[PDB]
Each structure stands twice: as C-alpha cells, then as structure tokens.
C-alpha cells in the first residue's frame, strides 16, 4: 500500500 | 527474520513531446507484487504476484489513484529540478524515488526509508530516525527547508510506522506460502579440464530464495580468492535466484578444495567437495 501524501521538491 | 516492503518509482522526462515516462513497482523482499507503467494501456496499478490478487476493486482503485498522483508529483519535480540545476529543456532527465519499511522478527516496525535521486545521484533522503533529511547539495537544501517547513517528515513517519508496516503484515500473511517460505539453494559442483594439468571447479547454487547468499572457496580449510571467478546473483525468471563461483586448480588436487554456501534456508552452511 503506497502513501498517502504527496509533496514536491 | 525481518521483512521489507519497498516501492520503486522512475520518471524519465521526454523533451521532444509529452509527459515523462513513469514506472512504479512494489516489492516484498525479493518478490515484485505490483506495477504501474505509464506507457501501458490500462493506466491501472496491476498485480504481479498471485497473493495480491486477493485484494478487491477498491484496493486497485486506491493504488491507481495514488500512483497517478505520484507520476504528476514527479513530473512537477523534473521541471523544478531543471530549474534548480539550470538545465535546458533539450535534455532528458531522471528522477528516482524509493521508500518503504521493515518489520522485524517480532513483526513490529523495524525501520523506514525514503530516498530521492536526480539523474542517478543522491538528492535528498530521510535519515534513519525519520525526522530529518540528508541533502546532497545546495539545490537539495532548498527542498530540505521547504520540507521541514511543511513537516513532511512527520507525515512520512506516520506512513512508515503505521500504514506501511500494517500492510506489509497483511501481505506477509496472505502470501505466506511463498513470501514466508525459504528456498534453500540447490547446489552442485562441476569439473572440467582446461589442460592436462589444470581443471576448473565450479560451485553452483540454483533456485534459491531470497537473493541473499554467499559462496566461498577454501583450500585445505582456508579462504582462497586467487584464481577464482564468479558471477553476480541473477534472477532465474521464476522468482528464484542463481549464483556460481569457480576456482582453477592443479588436476589431481581437487580434494583440497571446498565450496561453502551460506543461505537463510540453510540451518548450517553447506560444504561441497568434488567427490
């Protein structure tokens, strides 16, 4: 199960 | 024995036309169980091991949604990094991310990781305590400060210690007939003359699982590396692995030489001899 919250560099 | 769940993500920019090529795979230990390929028609996360097919439509819809979000995050990232590193739009570039978790023999959280690369080099990585970041250069320092401010690490740790371990636990159980089964290496030795006076002894380990293994040659009970050869461990294609190691010896003296095999599936290391 992958996450879940995505944030960019 | 510990177990791991890892997810591997590769995005490659396509400067000539369109969105980046994006490929995601998920693993438990050395067993791939899911994939996503942007070039494929389904645009779905897809099963790659039988025991994950247990999951229902809602699992696949959820994974598909998240992995698609992942692809876009990486697309954005390729743009941002081009900017950081002052690159033209002419060149194709690569972002890789790997993250995941380990459980120990107590089936509890053991460790977590989250690592990011640009063009095949370290960029930024979560540290082992999952609260801070290792930034490789000054561009990564920007990312580090941005991520500290938004406390991404706290959110990741929550994933790595909760959801991640919980689902590794679930997979380990559902797939126990394979995932929790060790395949001891099937070993043998071959022998052939290279001359009237020399011969090559090759120690084979086949069909073993997991990949971790050590083959060592000894002469009269001491490690020998000289005049030996070897191959890196390789997938057989059926979910198991292969390795061999060879020494060249004076013929008639084969009995001095032993091959020693260490593997998880072997209670005690194995000693092979010619005869």
């Amino acid at each position: 199960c992958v996450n879940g919250s995505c944030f960019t560099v | 024995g510990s177990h791991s769940m890892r997810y591997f993500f590769t995005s490659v920019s396509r400067p000539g036309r369109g969105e980046p090529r994006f490929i995601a795979v998920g693993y438990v230990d050395d067993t791939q169980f899911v994939r996503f390929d942007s070039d494929a028609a389904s645009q779905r996360m897809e099963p790659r091991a039988p025991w994950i097919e247990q999951e229902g439509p809602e699992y696949w819809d959820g994974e598909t949604r998240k992995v698609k979000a992942h692809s876009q995050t990486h697309r954005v990232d390729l743009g941002t990094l081009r900017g950081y590193y002052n690159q033209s739009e002419a060149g194709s570039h690569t972002v890789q991310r790997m993250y995941g978790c380990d459980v120990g023999s107590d089936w509890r959280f053991l460790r977590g990781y989250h690592q990011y690369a640009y063009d095949g080099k370290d960029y930024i990585a979560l540290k082992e305590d999952l609260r801070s970041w290792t930034a490789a250069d000054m561009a990564a320092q920007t990312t580090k400060h941005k991520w500290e401010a938004a406390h991404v690490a706290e959110q990741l740790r929550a994933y790595l210690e909760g959801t991640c371990v919980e689902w590794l636990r679930r997979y380990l159980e559902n797939g126990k007939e394979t995932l929790q089964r060790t395949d001891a290496p099937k070993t043998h030795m071959t022998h052939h003359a290279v001359s009237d006076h020399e011969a090559t002894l090759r120690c084979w380990a086949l069909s073993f699982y997991p990949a971790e293994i050590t083959l060592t040659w000894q002469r009269d009970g001491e490690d020998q590396t000289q005049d030996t050869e070897l191959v890196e461990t390789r997938p057989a294609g059926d979910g198991t692995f292969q390795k061999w190691v060879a020494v060249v010896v004076p013929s008639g003296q084969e009995q001095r030489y032993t091959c020693h095999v260490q593997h998880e599936g072997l209670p005690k290391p194995l000693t092979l001899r010619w005869e």
């Binding site: - | 791939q32 194709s92 690369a117 095949g120 080099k121 052939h192 294609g237």
Partner: protein
C-alpha cells in the same frame, strides 16, 4: 552520470537439448534507463522476448531481465544484444551452457 550495463546470458534451468527451457538476458548496473536488449538465435532476433518491470538497486543503477522460451540443441547458438548510450557499439554476449 552514465553507467554502462553489465550483462549475463544464461538458462533458467540446466541445459539439455530436446528439453524446453527459458533463455535469460540480465542487464544491470546501468544509467540512464533507456536500453535496447534483443535475444538472438543463430544471429537472428527472437521476436517476442519479454522483460521484467524496470527497477533499480540502492546505488540507483537500473536492472532488467529479458527472457523467452527456447529448446537448446547442440548446434544452435544463442546470444544477447545490448545497446545503451554508454556503448559506442551494440554489445553481443553469446550463451555458454556453463556460464
């Protein structure tokens, strides 16, 4: 950074002529991911080779397994052809029963 692929050609099972088997070409250690891999029978391309899903090792180098079914004979020659940006020339590795 560019890394060149290392290459292994081998059988999934002990090679016996007359017996169906699988021919493997394992490419690893390479960067970037773009790579062309063909399996050849007597110098000529086997038409539907499959490959694994692209993944990478901890040093971020990529690896792929290419494979197809085949039945060894004693006269037949098998090889693997690899082209990468690192390679001036497409590299060909012949299959040897004993690796």
């Amino acid at each position: 950074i560019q890394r060149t692929p290392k290459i292994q050609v081998y059988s999934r099972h002990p090679a016996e002529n007359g017996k169906s088997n699988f021919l493997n070409c394992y490419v690893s250690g390479f960067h970037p991911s773009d790579i062309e891999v063909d399996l050849l029978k007597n110098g000529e391309r086997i038409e539907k080779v499959e490959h694994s899903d692209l993944s990478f090792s901890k040093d971020w180098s990529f690896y792929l397994l290419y494979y197809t079914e085949f039945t060894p004979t004693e006269k037949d020659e098998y090889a693997c052809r690899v082209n990468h940006v690192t390679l001036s020339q497409p590299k060909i590795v012949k299959w040897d029963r004993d690796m």
